[PDB]
Amino acid sequence: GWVRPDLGELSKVTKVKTDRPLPENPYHSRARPEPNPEVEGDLKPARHGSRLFFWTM
């Protein structure tokens, strides 16, 4: 028997069932260190303008 595979039927991405489970963290690395605290919310007008030497507001 053994029908020859047509060009290009040795292609065409394939499913397969397994028995072992799909892995988490296959790169055997540590966890993520820290997120950055996000600055959100509305903003008020500035406290007394510039707070430089002078030029107050």
CB of 52 to other proteins, least distance (A): 9
Compute CA distances 57 → 32, 40, 45, whole Å: 44, 25, 10
Q: How many CB atoms lie within 10 A of CB 27?
A: 4
Of 32 and 47, CB closest to other proteins: 47
Of 27 and 53, CB closest to other proteins: 53
Binding site for other proteins (CB under 8 A): 53-54, 56
CB of 51 to other proteins, least distance (A): 9
